[PDB]
Enzyme design. Structure first.
Site, mmCIF file in Angstrom:
data_model
loop_
_atom_site.group_PDB
_atom_site.id
_atom_site.type_symbol
_atom_site.label_atom_id
_atom_site.label_comp_id
_atom_site.label_asym_id
_atom_site.label_seq_id
_atom_site.Cartn_x
_atom_site.Cartn_y
_atom_site.Cartn_z
ATOM 1 N N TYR A 135 9.405 5.346 9.467
ATOM 2 C CA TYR A 135 8.017 5.687 9.194
ATOM 3 C C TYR A 135 7.924 6.884 8.264
ATOM 4 O O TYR A 135 7.284 6.824 7.207
ATOM 5 C CB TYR A 135 7.316 5.965 10.515
ATOM 6 C CG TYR A 135 5.825 6.086 10.437
ATOM 7 C CD1 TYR A 135 5.229 7.285 10.113
ATOM 8 C CD2 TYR A 135 5.010 5.012 10.713
ATOM 9 C CE1 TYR A 135 3.881 7.402 10.044
ATOM 10 C CE2 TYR A 135 3.657 5.126 10.645
ATOM 11 C CZ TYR A 135 3.098 6.321 10.311
ATOM 12 O OH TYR A 135 1.743 6.436 10.243
ATOM 13 N N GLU A 136 8.583 7.977 8.627
ATOM 14 C CA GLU A 136 8.429 9.210 7.870
ATOM 15 C C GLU A 136 9.099 9.124 6.509
ATOM 16 O O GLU A 136 8.620 9.722 5.541
ATOM 17 C CB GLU A 136 8.987 10.369 8.674
ATOM 18 C CG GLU A 136 8.247 11.627 8.428
ATOM 19 C CD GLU A 136 6.755 11.427 8.510
ATOM 20 O OE1 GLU A 136 6.292 10.806 9.488
ATOM 21 O OE2 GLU A 136 6.040 11.891 7.597
#
Ligand SMILES: CCCCCCCCCCCCCCCCCC(=O)OC[C@H](CO[C@@H]1O[C@H](CO[C@H]2O[C@H](CO)[C@H](O)[C@H](O)[C@H]2O)[C@H](O)[C@H](O)[C@H]1O)OC(=O)CCCCCCCCCCCCCCCCC
Ligand SMILES: CCCCCCCCCCCCCCCCCC(=O)OC[C@H](CO[C@@H]1O[C@H](CO[C@H]2O[C@H](CO)[C@H](O)[C@H](O)[C@H]2O)[C@H](O)[C@H](O)[C@H]1O)OC(=O)CCCCCCCCCCCCCCCCC
Ligand SMILES: CCCCCCCCCCCCCCCCCC(=O)OC[C@H](CO[C@@H]1O[C@H](CO)[C@H](O)[C@H](O)[C@H]1O)OC(=O)CCCCCCCCCCCCCCCCC
Ligand SMILES: CCCCCCCCCCCCCCCCCC(=O)OC[C@H](CO[C@@H]1O[C@H](CO)[C@H](O)[C@H](O)[C@H]1O)OC(=O)CCCCCCCCCCCCCCCCC
Ligand SMILES: CCCCCCCCCCCCCCCC(=O)OC[C@H](CO[C@@H]1O[C@H](CS(=O)(=O)O)[C@@H](O)[C@H](O)[C@H]1O)OC(=O)CCCCCCCCCCCCCCC
Ligand SMILES: CCCCCCCCCCCCCCCC(=O)OC[C@H](CO[C@@H]1O[C@H](CS(=O)(=O)O)[C@@H](O)[C@H](O)[C@H]1O)OC(=O)CCCCCCCCCCCCCCC
Lengths: 33, 41, 239, 51, 145, 48, 48, 68, 42, 271, 85, 189, 17
Positions: free
Chosen positions: E80-81
């Site tokens: 995600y990041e």
């Protein structure tokens, strides 16, 4: 398939949030069983 | 000790029935406020 | 988590064990005095572990061993460091008992004094008994044996360095002073050997608890009991 | 500070013994009785009854 | 941006705390950045958990929140990041990245610290390019996962 | 520091009084206190 | 009647003092052996 | 005489090295106020309503307040 | 913050167990000597 | 045999020091006893009030403003070995020794500090598993034990705990702070903020009584000061566009309204 | 439980360079010890210097088979990670 | 087997309560002193993972004490006086000076011990040559590290030396030493 | 080892009933 253990059977709201937001479908099916 | 002294003073003067407290301006201190120490003014 | 699960498993393990042991003790007592229901087999008192923990251990260990396999003695030189079931300081104790007895008898025959043989054979008897009890270190007698041997060796060291021996008097005064020789030295080495191998049994025998130990305890019944015993039964428990 | 905290949690019985019990209930009564019986002639009113 | 003197002194005290938590005595720069990130995550985490609710923090031991944060659930936060920071890097004129973190304070999310310029749109301007860029960057994480 | 004068500080709510009129008396007191030490600056935080 | 809550009809003078005295007698340097204070009321929510 | 005075001087230097309480934790067998330790409190008599006044000035003279 | 511990089931058990064990020493290793006296022909 | 004397010298040192302290104690507690005046006053007061008062009380109830005084006095006037028990028990305590927990009113008595609560960190096993409580509490403990607490700058700390609607009245904030104050053997002061949520006439007098409490705390150092339910006095003090829709107020210049709108959109979207 | 393997690697390489006397560019994460000049009695002193710098204790069984710098780094990181429990 | 009902393939050894608190978290196994306040590994971990410092302090100081460190015996009521002298009867400044001196001494001693351990490594690498008679000249790094952390009893060292001298076999190591339990006698100590 | 185990077990069973 270490030590025999038992569950506690109570579903909080915190637990419901965790299970529904971060676990897959098979985990939820186990809870329903 | 300072708060104790002020408490004693105030309580005597009260039950016997100015908040101006001055603090000096030293220029040699590192706390010292240069004339234009402030910004954007 | 996978961290609180470990804590939970260890708590359950320990509690099951403590309960099995309490059952064994209480059943031994009730059986020694008749009152037992006659389906009882007194061999069940030799199962030390617990049935539940034994089953868990067996299953886990077989799973491991299954899924993982998808003088001088040249064969094993380190046989002395192997758990044979006794205390490490067990042959030394009997050796020292034999030495004490032989030396005491020999000396008291060679001179005419009656203290050497009495001390030597008394210590020999006590140390042979302790070295007999030390042949199974898991039991309760296995621990009282170590305690007895330590006591005897300490007393020997004391008599040697503080009072000396009767057959060692001289004409002078500083020639006959109690000093440490070879018997006291062996006894001191033995005491150190008992302390640095294992002497930790029967740890629940001490001086009773104070009112100072139970000041912060979370139990009102226990605190009241201790205060009562020490003479403060009438003090007010503003807690 | 940490060492003192650890030591104080392991030494509660000995602390109470040396603070509340050693003198007041062990040494003082022994000394008092022995000292009284050292003075005080070998009578009976004085040796047993008045104490 | 937008701070006062009180904010700066509070930040320095918080940075001292954040330097303690790493086994150091002197404040470095990453301790200041960590202080900012910690302020923000504290603020959110304290607003979510408030009653029988909960469900966001992940290291307390109780039933809702596991202890070591399973690794399958950490790979996902990393993905995600990574996607979000990559999209914020290749978009022209976006704010600039100061620090990228995974599960700060044990919360089950990522966190990216963006520093901007207050002399370009002076707390009042919002063009259309900026809004479209922000939409893309906020959907990047879902798409990458 | 550039006025060569004396600095005096207090807070606003210091003059709010549970006793009637003692606010007025303490106002008088502060004012005369500063008057006798002229020239000076009298800075009042919490002014509103 | 005495066990009314704070904000009762006082200014910190009478009912405050009797409540503080009840406290000091029940708590501070109690020698209260055997003593029981068997208070009675009908609306227990109002007690301080 | 030098030896017999050096003994006392050594004791005084040791007492100097302490300098205070920093390093001493709180103790519960020895609070700092002897009235807590000795269970001392007033009674019913000897308490005048005009006493608190003089009380205060005693306080004012103990804390150093020079006003009196 | 605190995680609302009192409505939980692992924490209640661990709490009660830790307090009970911290009250007073519970190890009785010397009472087992009766287990070495079950056979005596006296 | 020169080293059999060390334990006895240690014992003598300890006992001697404690004896000196105790002799100060006994000399202090001897010269502060009531002198002859107060003892005589006590005796006379018991004679006049412990027998004579309740007796005439009984007479009054049997007979029930100076006229009534004369009436009842006239009417009721008209019509009205220290050691033996210890032997009869056969031929028929210094609370401070075991309980050093005290509640006291300190430094101005002419505030109810508690000295040495009997609690420890073993009354809260839940602290052992909460990883975010270790550093603040641990720092406080290591500071208090090292003596460095009496010279630090005072702190403010906010403890939040989710709502309490349990059948029990157990509260782990108060329990945790009393455990901190009992593990280190300090003194603790407790007070509830709801007692200051009382305002009349628009003068929040509670927030000046609280000033008097705070500046009193500053006098009894070192101490912990617990203060529960601050939300009772810390609520949000009192935008709405419904005025320019239905009431047409419109008392603001156009540029100000525009500026508010700009800042609001930017704040909602990018902060 | 989560270790910055990058920091551990930089510090390992700096310690190795200072111990052997070669410069930091020559110490590569896959460089064995035998070619950097290391002889048995010094693949031990390097281990002692590592422990002394990081203040940890090495697991010996795995420490018998350390031959490249990356294994040193991974051993140290697996030790630092398993510190609380 | 004694087990009437249940018996796994390895006999059950009755483990007992621990009798001493573990080494802290800050200490190493060796003789060189710790770190005054914070360890060095703390710098290579997540800030939300370094809570084990203060947790370990809490555990050793307050909540995990084995009931064998709380026995009241006649030896301990005298050790109380020794310790109370050191903690309340001596000024912290002299204690600080002694602390510095003791640190310096321990550093010298650790340096000496490390020198000796390396010497032992050469000596046994030489002895394995006599043993094998031929080629073998290496040593065991495992044994070096175990010697540095005091994990061998003297008997294990002697038996290892003998095994080396007779059959080379440098990789056959004695098992490991177990920690010494706290000695107790009775009301006495 | 355990050479008199079975003998002692049998004996205690058969004698003290
Ligand atoms: C058979 C060996 C007899 C012998 O030696 O025995 C002598 C002593 C043990 O003898 C004990 O000896 C004691 C007296 O010892 C003293 O007297 C001895 C000669 O009388 C030696 O001087 C010895 O060092 C010294 O300690 C008392 O007589 C005891 O009764 C007697 O049992 O053994 C020893 O010296 C101890 C042997 C050294 C330990 C190896
Ligand atoms: C030689 C140098 C001696 C210099 C000196 O002024 O020596 C005198 C010292 C006593 O020194 C006092 O030592 C004190 C030590 O305080 C320090 O230590 C104290 C705790 O010990 C407190 O913590 C205090 O805050 C901290 O600063 C301060 O330094 C005082 O100013 C100083 O007078 O005695 C001694 O040398 C020790 C006595 C041993 C005699 C045997
Ligand atoms: C040096 C002599 C060999 C060392 C020795 O005492 O072995 C000591 C060993 C220790 O013996 C074993 O020790 C192990 C250590 O864990 C286990 O505890 C075993 O229970 C214990 O039997 O015992 C011997 O085999 C002694 C044999 C020779 C006796 C000496 C007679 C004099
Ligand atoms: C010298 C004092 C002896 C203490 C040294 C201890 C060394 C030690 O631990 O060795 C190591 C082993 C002890 O072995 C320990 O045993 C434990 C179980 O109890 C565990 O097995 C530990 O792992 C193991 O370290 O020592 C021996 O096996 C016994 C050595 C006996 C030496 C005593 C010498 C004194 C005898 C003199 C009397 C002469 C009379 C004739
Ligand atoms: C008035 C009262 C007087 C009292 C008199 C008492 C006298 C009796 C004591 C006399 C002295 C006894 C010493 C006996 C020592 C011995 O036999 O050990 C028996 C051991 C076996 O140990 C054992 O080995 C066994 C394993 S194995 O099968 O043998 O390998 C294991 O079961 C056991 O635990 C282990 O100890 O035998 C050995 O393996 C070889 C000996 C190795 C050491 C040699 C030293 C012997 C003296 C050298 C000179
Ligand atoms: C009259 C004396 C009669 C006794 C004879 C001495 C028997 C032989 C020595 C006893 C074994 C030592 C036990 C042990 O080492 O405990 C650990 C002790 C501390 O005692 C421990 O101290 C602990 C508290 S603390 O460590 O001091 O903080 C505490 O938990 C523990 O109960 C207490 O024992 O540590 C010491 O350093 C003891 C060394 C003193 C040895 C000299 C003995 C003199 C002869």
């Amino acid at each position: 398939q270490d030590i025999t253990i038992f569950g506690n059977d109570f579903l909080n709201l915190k637990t419901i949030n965790y299970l529904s937001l971060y676990n897959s479908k098979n985990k939820i099916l186990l809870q329903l069983m | 000790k300072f708060r104790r002294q002020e408490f004693i003073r105030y309580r005597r003067e009260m039950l016997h029935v100015t908040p101006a407290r001055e603090v000096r301006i030293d220029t040699g201190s590192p706390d010292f406020i240069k004339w234009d120490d402030i910004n954007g003014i | 988590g996978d961290r609180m699960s470990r804590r939970l498993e260890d708590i359950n393990k320990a509690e099951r064990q403590r309960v099995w042991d309490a059952m064994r003790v209480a059943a031994a007592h009730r059986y020694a005095s008749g009152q037992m229901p006659a389906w009882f087999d007194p061999e069940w008192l030799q199962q030390e572990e617990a049935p539940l923990n034994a089953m868990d251990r067996m299953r886990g260990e077989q799973r491991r061993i299954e899924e993982q396999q998808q003088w001088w003695r040249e064969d094993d030189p380190y046989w002395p460091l192997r758990d044979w079931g006794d205390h490490p300081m067990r042959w030394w104790t009997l050796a020292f008992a034999a030495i004490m007895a032989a030396g005491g008898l020999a000396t008291s025959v060679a001179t005419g004094y009656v203290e050497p043989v009495q001390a030597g054979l008394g210590a020999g008897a006590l140390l042979a008994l302790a070295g007999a009890a030390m042949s199974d270190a898991r039991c309760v007698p296995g621990a009282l044996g170590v305690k007895l041997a330590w006591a005897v060796c300490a007393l020997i060291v004391l008599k040697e360095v503080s009072v000396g021996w009767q057959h060692k008097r001289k004409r002078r005064l500083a020639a006959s002073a109690p000093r440490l020789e070879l018997t006291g030295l062996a006894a001191a080495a033995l005491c150190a050997g008992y302390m640095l191998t294992d002497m930790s049994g029967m740890g629940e025998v001490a001086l009773p608890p104070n009112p100072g130990a139970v000041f912060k305890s979370p139990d009102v019944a226990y605190r009241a009991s201790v205060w009562q015993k020490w003479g403060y039964g009438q003090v007010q428990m503003r807690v | 500070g940490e060492r003192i905290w650890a030591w104080r949690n392991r030494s509660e019985n000995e602390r109470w013994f040396w603070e509340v019990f050693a003198w007041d209930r062990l040494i003082f009564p022994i000394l008092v009785i022995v000292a009284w019986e050292y003075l005080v002639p070998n009578h009976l009113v004085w040796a047993v009854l008045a104490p | 941006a937008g701070f006062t003197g009180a904010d700066v002194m509070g930040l320095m005290a918080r940075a001292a705390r954040m330097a303690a938590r790493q086994g150091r005595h002197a404040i470095t720069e990453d301790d200041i950045y960590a202080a900012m990130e910690n302020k923000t995550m504290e603020a959110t985490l304290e607003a979510s958990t408030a009653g029988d609710g909960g469900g966001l923090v992940g290291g307390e031991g109780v039933e809702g929140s596991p202890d070591p944060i399973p690794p399958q659930l950490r790979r996902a936060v990393s993905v995600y990041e990574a996607g979000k920071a990559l999209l914020a890097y290749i978009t022209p004129d976006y704010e600039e990245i100061a620090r990228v973190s995974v599960c700060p304070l044990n919360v089950l999310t990522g966190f990216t610290l963006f520093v901007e310029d207050e002399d370009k749109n002076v707390n009042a301007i919002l063009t259309r390019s900026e809004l479209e860029g922000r939409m893309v960057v906020h959907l990047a994480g879902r798409c990458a996962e | 520091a550039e006025g060569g004068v004396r600095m005096f500080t207090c807070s606003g709510t210091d003059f709010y009084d549970v006793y009637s009129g003692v606010g007025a008396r303490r106002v008088r007191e502060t004012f005369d206190r500063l008057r006798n030490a002229a020239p000076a600056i009298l800075f009042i935080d919490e002014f509103d | 009647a005495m066990g009314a809550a704070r904000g009762a009809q006082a200014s910190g003078d009478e009912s405050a003092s009797i409540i503080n005295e009840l406290l000091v007698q029940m708590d501070g340097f109690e020698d209260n052996r055997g003593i029981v204070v068997l208070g009675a009321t009908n609306r227990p929510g109002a007690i301080d | 005489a030098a030896v017999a005075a050096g003994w006392h001087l050594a004791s005084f230097a040791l007492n100097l090295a302490f300098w205070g309480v920093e390093g001493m934790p709180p103790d519960r067998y020895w609070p700092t106020s002897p009235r807590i330790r000795l269970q001392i409190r007033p009674g019913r008599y000897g308490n005048m309503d005009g006493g608190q006044r003089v009380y205060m000035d005693y306080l004012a003279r103990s804390e150093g307040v020079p006003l009196n | 913050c605190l995680p609302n511990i009192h409505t939980s089931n692992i924490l209640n058990f661990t709490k009660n167990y830790e307090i009970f064990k911290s009250a007073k020493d519970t190890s009785n290793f010397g009472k087992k000597i009766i287990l070495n006296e079950m056979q005596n022909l006296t | 045999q020169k080293m059999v004397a060390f334990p006895i010298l240690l014992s003598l040192s300890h006992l001697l020091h404690r004896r000196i302290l105790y002799l100060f104690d006994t000399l202090f507690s001897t010269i502060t006893q009531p002198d002859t005046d107060l003892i005589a006053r006590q005796e006379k007061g018991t004679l006049f009030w412990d027998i004579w008062a309740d007796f005439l009380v009984t007479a009054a109830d049997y007979y029930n403003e100076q006229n009534s005084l004369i009436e009842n006095i006239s009417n009721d006037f008209d019509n009205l070995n220290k050691i033996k028990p210890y032997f009869e028990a056969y031929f028929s305590l210094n609370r401070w020794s075991v309980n050093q927990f005290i509640t006291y009113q300190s430094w101005h008595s002419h505030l109810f500090i508690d000295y040495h609560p009997p609690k420890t960190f073993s009354h809260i096993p839940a602290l052992k598993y909460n990883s975010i409580l270790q550093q603040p509490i641990g720092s406080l403990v290591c500071q208090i034990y090292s003596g460095l607490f009496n010279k630090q700058i005072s702190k403010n700390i906010l403890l939040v705990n989710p709502k309490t609607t349990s059948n029990n009245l157990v509260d782990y904030n108060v329990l945790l702070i009393q455990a901190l104050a009992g593990e280190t053997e300090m003194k603790i002061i407790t007070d509830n903020a709801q007692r200051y949520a009382l305002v009349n006439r628009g003068f929040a007098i509670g927030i000046k009584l609280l000033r008097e409490v705070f500046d009193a705390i500053a006098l009894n150092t070192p101490c912990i000061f617990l203060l529960e339910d601050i939300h009772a006095i810390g609520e949000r003090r009192p935008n709405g566009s419904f005025k320019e829709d239905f009431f047409g107020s419109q008392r603001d210049e156009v540029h100000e309204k525009n500026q508010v709108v700009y800042q609001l959109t930017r704040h909602a979207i990018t902060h | 439980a989560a270790v910055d393997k990058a920091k551990v690697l930089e510090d390992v390489r700096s310690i190795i360079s200072t111990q052997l006397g070669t410069e930091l560019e020559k110490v590569a994460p896959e460089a064995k010890f035998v070619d950097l000049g290391a002889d048995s009695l010094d693949t031990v002193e390097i281990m002692m210097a590592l422990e002394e710098k990081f203040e940890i204790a090495l697991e010996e069984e795995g420490a018998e088979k350390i031959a490249t710098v990356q294994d040193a780094a991974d051993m140290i990181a697996a030790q630092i990670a398993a510190k609380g429990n | 087997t004694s087990a009437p009902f249940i018996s796994p393939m390895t006999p059950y050894v009755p483990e007992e309560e621990p009798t001493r608190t573990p080494p802290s978290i800050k200490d190493t196994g060796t003789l060189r002193p710790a770190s005054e306040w914070y360890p060095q590994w703390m710098q290579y971990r997540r800030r939300e993972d370094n809570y084990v410092f203060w947790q370990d302090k809490f555990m050793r100081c307050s909540t995990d004490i084995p009931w064998a460190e709380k026995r009241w015996t006649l030896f301990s009521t005298v050790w109380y006086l020794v310790q109370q002298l050191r903690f309340v009867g001596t000024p912290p400044a002299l204690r600080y000076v002694a602390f510095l001196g003791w640190r310096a001494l321990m550093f010298q001693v650790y340096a000496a011990h490390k020198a000796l351990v390396l010497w032992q490594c050469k000596l046994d690498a030489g002895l394995a040559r006599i043993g094998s008679g031929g080629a073998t000249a290496t040593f065991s790094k495992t044994m070096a590290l175990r010697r540095l952390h005091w994990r061998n009893s003297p008997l294990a060292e002697a038996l290892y030396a003998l095994n080396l001298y007779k059959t080379g076999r440098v990789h056959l190591l004695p098992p490991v030493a177990k920690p010494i339990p706290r000695p107790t006698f009775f009301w006495l100590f | 080892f355990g050479t008199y185990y079975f003998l002692q077990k049998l004996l205690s069973k058969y004698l003290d009933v």
